[PDB]
Structures are given as structure tokens and as C-alpha cells.
Design a protein around this ligand. Structure first.
Ligand SMILES: Nc1ncnc2c1ncn2[C@@H]1O[C@H](COP(=O)(O)OP(=O)(O)OP(=O)(O)O)[C@@H](O)[C@H]1O
Ligand SMILES: Nc1ncnc2c1ncn2[C@@H]1O[C@H](COP(=O)(O)OP(=O)(O)OP(=O)(O)O)[C@@H](O)[C@H]1O
Lengths: 319, 314
């Protein structure tokens, strides 16, 4: 079934490999990569690698946008972005002496007419879809609760929304009446929402947090824990998901790869345990690869056989 | 009279303003500019600001190339770049706490077929031209003797060449029988060409150096010396050029602005003293501007009155 991905603030992700960063001087290199970037494009590329049925949307502008669109065409990734006037941004990553120093731009401003054009296109796309993923931050010019209206439109077509965002843009959805089918906060994201610190073995405290009103009406909640696996909640059923050790090359974008795996699993109507395994297997495989938003499908299939899903008992067990 | 500028190694110059560069973490900014860059595009923009008749050429590739062409079009700068398949590079400048931390890319590779295409275009352009400027490094794929072929072609058409390049691409031209009309090497470049140190009493050392066989047959040699003005040689005549003390904002690209001023001056048949004043006045005006490859022509005209050209004995 068709998965639509949404990237409201894409970028050209520029990556420089340097053995030394020298301040106040010229640094030279031929080790440069320039790739379609942004959390939602990470998701798109992983779903594509898994063999899923995907189409990418969002906004792209100018010659920088035209570059992104051409690179997706060369990879045969289906696309349906809306045009805007201002230039799509660059994101700079400098890799040096085991550091990732980054420069992130604020980016283009999206106009009122451009918002309307995007939403018209979105409505047409979701009539063809079974699942939508929505990742990352809002572009300038978009209202802080813009993701509420995307979830509202998806509900009108009975489409399942997977939402991976943070800060005000997440909080505004949780405060509103239009709930996504799935959210995937990491622990720090969860700590920031609640102003709570979690300690070792956070399972009991996470269970209590996720039963609070702010999380009501969301069918699936997945709290990813990096190398330690995940905690999840499906309605009133909690799970602990345990994963094996791997040699990570670059874990950047592993959260996005987990969203891709979950979307792929939902599209094939996987039961709870297999759904969670597809999410973990994809994040793991991403972490094994040097380049971000990419998985080796053979690593993924290997990992599926070695993940343990554990159902948690309720308070009244042994009543 | 028409000036054609050559830029084989252009760029999108990206300039970031930060309060502090925090390493191994994210730095966020709304203070970003993205401008057509490369030494020869600095030259082009200043000639345009001065009021000269210019057309820009070189090679542009891909979507980054199309951005540069669009920006030149918006500024009303005539252009005739040759297309290449690989993408034109970005250059990064991070400005923080009085530092300028830069990252430069090796850039695209030009194919033999694209080289042949560029050379055909260049043949056509120089028939209408009186002056040509050649700036910066060679793009990957170009042969090390590439600028010599350009100087030869200009010689055949009686076009005066201003050549501002470095290292091997400079040495090979100066070894050959087709001499440029003007060169403008700085002290760093002069040290490389001659294998000699110019740290002690540089002005006296430069005057001796310019008499060497290295530089025979070149009508004009201009050694710009930053705030210290310049020393120049026109045939057998040496000149010292004295400039007034001024407040600089950003002196980056002032060498390119000097080349622009010299090209403009030569296009209007300026006598020796006036030519040298246009060069200095453009360089000075560039250093007064925050943005690179830009001058206020009113600053330039005022500077002309306050620069003194001094003839040296012999
Ligand atoms: N070092 C690792 N070893 C094994 N698996 C990993 C590792 N890092 C990430 N993963 C896999 O990816 C999943 C998601 O990672 P994590 O919880 O760090 O995502 P995130 O914090 O949302 O990442 P990002 O924000 O960088 O996209 C993990 O639950 C796990 O299955
Ligand atoms: N800080 C400054 N203040 C005033 N004028 C300046 C300054 N820097 C440069 N200029 C003017 O511009 C001219 C050319 O600059 P300069 O001699 O520094 O070029 P350059 O050495 O070729 O520079 P680069 O090597 O960076 O290309 C100077 O001779 C002077 O007229």
C-alpha cells in the first residue's frame, strides 16, 4: 500500500570529510558529498531501500530545490513536491577528528498562497494513500500548529499518520483534537515534554508518563532508546523491545530509519511484535552504514530473527 | 571598448555570520548570503560597477551553475559561459569573533569535449574584444598549459591580456613567447616564482627582482602592497604609488578589484599615472565595502584625487 512522506523543510545535505579543521584559515578537501536531506527524505530513502511503495511530498524552491528533485529522479524515487519561490536551504556537516560540527540555516519563507497550493496537492495525494509519515520541523511562514491540519485531512480519508516531530510543533498536536496513529519520541524528547529526568531502568516511569492525558487517543507510542532498543505502548498494552549489539558506523538518522520500518510494517498489516521488529531492524541497519538515510536490506532481514518483543504485565496481575 | 573576463573556477560563495563556532555541535543562523564567487567574478562585478563594457565567460555546470547565471542576469551583467555536465562548486566562509574559517572544494572535472567547446566560444568572444582578464586557478581536467593557449589566441587578435594567476600556470606562461600585457603578482607569489625571501626591506628587493629575465617582454608589472600602495614597472620606468590612509571594513577581494580598475583604465586609454590611480582607487573602494567584489563608484572617483604617482630614478 502507498506511503506518502512529508518534508516541510528539506535541504541539500553537504558533508565534508577533513582530518583537521583549522580555525581562521583555508581548509581544502575533495571529500565532499551533497545529498537530498532533511528527516523526511531520510525516511523516504529507507522505505525505498526496503522495497516499499513510497512517494515524497513537501515544498522545494529555486535551483537548490531543482537539484534535490533531479537527484530523486536519478534514484527513481517517486515525488510530488509543491513549488515555492524562495530557495531551499543547505545543511553543512563537517566531519573531523571524530566530531560532527554542523551549520544549519533558517531557510526559505513559505507564503500564504504557497501554503494553499501545498494543501490542495496534499488532499489529492492522501486520497491515494494508506499511510502518511510527517517528519521534522516547520519551514518559516507555516503556523506552529500546521501539523494539526495535516492530521485532520488524513482522518477524513482514514489514513494512518506516523508523526516524528518535537517542541512546539509536537505539543500543539498533543493539545489538539486530531491525534496521529503513531508517535516516536526519543527519551530526551520525552524528558523535555514532561520536564522529568529519567534514571537507569526508566521503564516504570515511562509507563506512568505515557498514561497521562497529554498522550490520550494515540494508538501507538514508540520510545526509542538507541542501542538499548525501545519501550512501546499499543492502547493499554506495554512492550519492552530488546535488540542485539552491533558495530555502528554512523547512527545519525537511525530515528528516521525506524519511522521508515514502522511505516513499511504497517503497510503490510504486520501484527504488533513484527511491526516493532521492522522498526528496530531498519534503525539498526542505518546505524551500520556510513552514509545517512540508507540501509542494506540483507542486514535488515538478519536483524528481524534476533529481536525479542516482551509483553509487560498489568498492575492487577495476581490481583 | 569591450573587456572579456575569464573564470575557469567559479563558485557559489556562501558566507555565514556566527556569534561563536561551537565545535562538535549544531550552529544555527539566519545570517547567510550566497553570491556568485571566484576571483574572475569579483573582477566582473567591479568592472560593471565602474561602468565598463564587460562580458563574463568561463564554465558553469548543473543547478549550481544555473543559479550563478541567474544571479548575473538579475544584476544585468552580460554573460557567455560554456556549459559543463558536472556541478559548479560551493565555497564556505564562516565569520566568527574576528576569524574567517574557510572550506574550499576541489570542484568539477571539465571533459576534453567541454574544453574544445569552451575554446570555440572564446575564439568568437575575442574578435569583438579589446582587453581580456584571466583570473584564478585552473579547474580540474584542464591541462597545466591551458592559460598559455588563451594568451596565444589573444595575441593573434591584438587583445591585451591582464593575467592574475599563480604557481605553475603563471610560470609556464612567463616561460613562453606569448607574453601577457600586464601581471599583478603579490609578494607571496613573487617568492614562489624566484625562490627568494621578501621579508627584509621588500620594496628594495622587488625593484631588483623585476629586472630579471623571468619578466622580459611584459609591458606592465604591478606589485600591489595592501595599505602600502604599490610598486610598478612600465618597460624601463619604475613607479611608486602612494595611497592615503583609510578605514577598511573587509579587504577580501581587493586584489581582484585592482585588476578590474586596471582593465577599466586600459579600456579608456589612460596614461601611465591615471591607469595606476584607477587600479588603486578600485582596490581601496572594495576594501571599504562589507560585501566582496563590490565598489561605490563615488568612493572611487574621490580616491583618484588623493593618490600620488612617483617616478623612480632609472
Ligand atoms: N548504536 C546503535 N546500535 C544498535 N542499534 C541502534 C544504535 N543506534 C540506533 N539504533 C537503532 O535505531 C533506533 C533509533 O535510534 P535512536 O533511539 O537513537 O533514534 P533517535 O534518537 O530518534 O535518532 P535521530 O534523532 O538521530 O534520527 C534504535 O531503537 C535502534 O534499534
Ligand atoms: N586594508 C586596506 N586598506 C586600504 N586599502 C587596501 C587594503 N587592502 C587592499 N587595499 C587596496 O587594494 C589594493 C590591492 O590589495 P592587495 O595588494 O592586498 O592585493 P593582493 O595581495 O593581490 O590580495 P589577495 O592576495 O588577497 O588577492 C591595495 O594596493 C590597496 O590599493
Amino acid at each position: 500500500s502507498l506511503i506518502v512522506t512529508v518534508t516541510m523543510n528539506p535541504s541539500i545535505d553537504i558533508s565534508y570529510l577533513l582530518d583537521h579543521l583549522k580555525l581562521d584559515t583555508v581548509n581544502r578537501t575533495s571529500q565532499v558529498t551533497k545529498t537530498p536531506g532533511g528527516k523526511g527524505l531520510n525516511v523516504t530513502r529507507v522505505i525505498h531501500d526496503l522495497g516499499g511503495d513510497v512517494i515524497a511530498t513537501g515544498v522545494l524552491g529555486g535551483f537548490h530545490g531543482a537539484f534535490i528533485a533531479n537527484e530523486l529522479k536519478k534514484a527513481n524515487i517517486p515525488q510530488a513536491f509543491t513549488s515555492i519561490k524562495e530557495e531551499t536551504r543547505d545543511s553543512i556537516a563537517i566531519l573531523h577528528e571524530g566530531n560532527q560540527t554542523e551549520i544549519l540555516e533558517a531557510g526559505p519563507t513559505v507564503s500564504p498562497e504557497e501554503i494553499s497550493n501545498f494543501l490542495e496537492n496534499f488532499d489529492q495525494l492522501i486520497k491515494q494513500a494508506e499511510i502518511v509519515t510527517i517528519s521534522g520541523s516547520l519551514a518559516k511562514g507555516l503556523p506552529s500548529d500546521f501539523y494539526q491540519e495535516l492530521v485532520q485531512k488524513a482522518h477524513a480519508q482514514e489514513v494512518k499518520v506516523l508523526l516524528d516531530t518535537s517542541g512546539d510543533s509536537l505539543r500543539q498536536v498533543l493539545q489538539g483534537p486530531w491525534k496521529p496513529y503513531l508517535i516516536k519520541p526519543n527519551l530526551e524528547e520525552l524528558e523535555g515534554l514532561l520536564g522529568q529526568d529519567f534514571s537507569e531502568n526508566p521503564l516504570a516511569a515511562v509507563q506512568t508518563a505515557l498514561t497521562k492525558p497529554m498522550f490520550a487517543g494515540i494508538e501507538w507510542i514508540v520510545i526509542s532508546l538507541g542501542k538499548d532498543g525501545a519501550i512501546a505502548k499499543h492502547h493499554d498494552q506495554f512492550y519492552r523491545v530488546k535488540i542485539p549489539t552491533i558495530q555502528a558506523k554512523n547512527p545519525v538518522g537511525s530515528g528516521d530509519a525506524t519511522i521508515a520500518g514502522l511505516a513499511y510494517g504497517l503497510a503490510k498489516d504486520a501484527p504488533a511484535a513484527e511491526l516493532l521488529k521492522w522498526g528496530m531492524a531498519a534503525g539498526m541497519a542505518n546505524a551500520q552504514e556510513r552514509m545517512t538515510g540508507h540501509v542494506d536490506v540483507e542486514n535488515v532481514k538478519k536483524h528481524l530473527m534476533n529481536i525479542q518483543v516482551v509483553e509487560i504485565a498489568k498492575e492487577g496481575h495476581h490481583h
